[PDB]
């Protein structure tokens, strides 16, 4: 139970650190986000087909 | 200004030193020009990269009239 | 870059080809070289063609 006092060890930040995306309500990047670059599953080419 | 340009460092130099045990094919030193020359059981790449042609200990020695520095492998 | 890429097609009819470049200002004559053909597993003469 985060954010329930000093003694709990997870107070005043809820384990989210300081003012990042993870600290915002509903914040955080989508799956595969590489900081702005096209992710590895897009740098590499498609191959094959499903039989 | 019209300056402020450079290239990424290519990480040259000696990778395995004297007396180190190496496997066949391991490159000992990467260089520009023949700072070192290939000796016994040592090959020379197309970019003058010296690689081991046999397993053994790396030994540095100086021989010849030109006072050059040679790398050889003593395969026990 | 003004040198243009060309393809060398094997004469054996396998359809294998190599690709390289050639200078068009000089050396108008077609390029003929003996190169290995993987389909017939032999070194045969390759003839210049057009990349398309």
């Amino acid at each position: 139970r985060l954010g329930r006092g000093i003694g709990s060890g997870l107070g005043k930040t809820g384990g989210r650190g300081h003012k990042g995306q993870k600290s915002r309500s509903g914040g955080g990047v989508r799956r595969g986000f590489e900081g702005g670059q096209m992710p590895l599953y897009r740098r590499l080419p498609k191959f094959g087909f499903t039989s | 200004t019209r300056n402020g340009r450079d290239s990424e460092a290519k990480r040259l130099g000696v990778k395995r030193f004297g007396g180190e045990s190496v496997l066949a094919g391991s490159i000992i030193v990467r260089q520009r020009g023949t700072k070192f020359h290939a000796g016994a059981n040592v090959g020379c790449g197309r970019d003058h990269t010296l690689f081991a042609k046999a397993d053994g200990k790396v030994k540095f020695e100086v021989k010849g009239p030109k006072n050059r520095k040679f790398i050889s492998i003593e395969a026990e | 870059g003004i040198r243009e890429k060309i393809k060398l097609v094997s004469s054996a009819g396998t359809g294998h080809f190599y690709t390289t470049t050639k200078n068009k200002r000089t050396k108008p004559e077609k390029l003929e070289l003996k190169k290995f053909d993987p389909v017939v597993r032999q070194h045969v003469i390759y003839k210049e063609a057009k990349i398309k």
């Binding site: 799956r31 595969g32 992710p39 590895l40 599953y41 897009r42 740098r43 590499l44 080419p45 498609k46 191959f47 094959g48 | - | 890429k5 690709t19 390289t20």
Partner: protein, 64 residues
Amino acid sequence: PKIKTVRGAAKRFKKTGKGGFKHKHANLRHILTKKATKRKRHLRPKAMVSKGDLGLVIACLPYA
């Protein structure tokens, strides 16, 4: 609701026996002629996904 797989990653990675993922090498589409044959030959065989990207791949592929 059911988790949706990232379809772009599902068309490029196949799970292996020990849980790994194999992918084809890049840099072999349309500027390959100027690349040495040895370079092209090494890119032809299939490759293993690196350890750093294992977490990202598994996240994109939860059902496989």
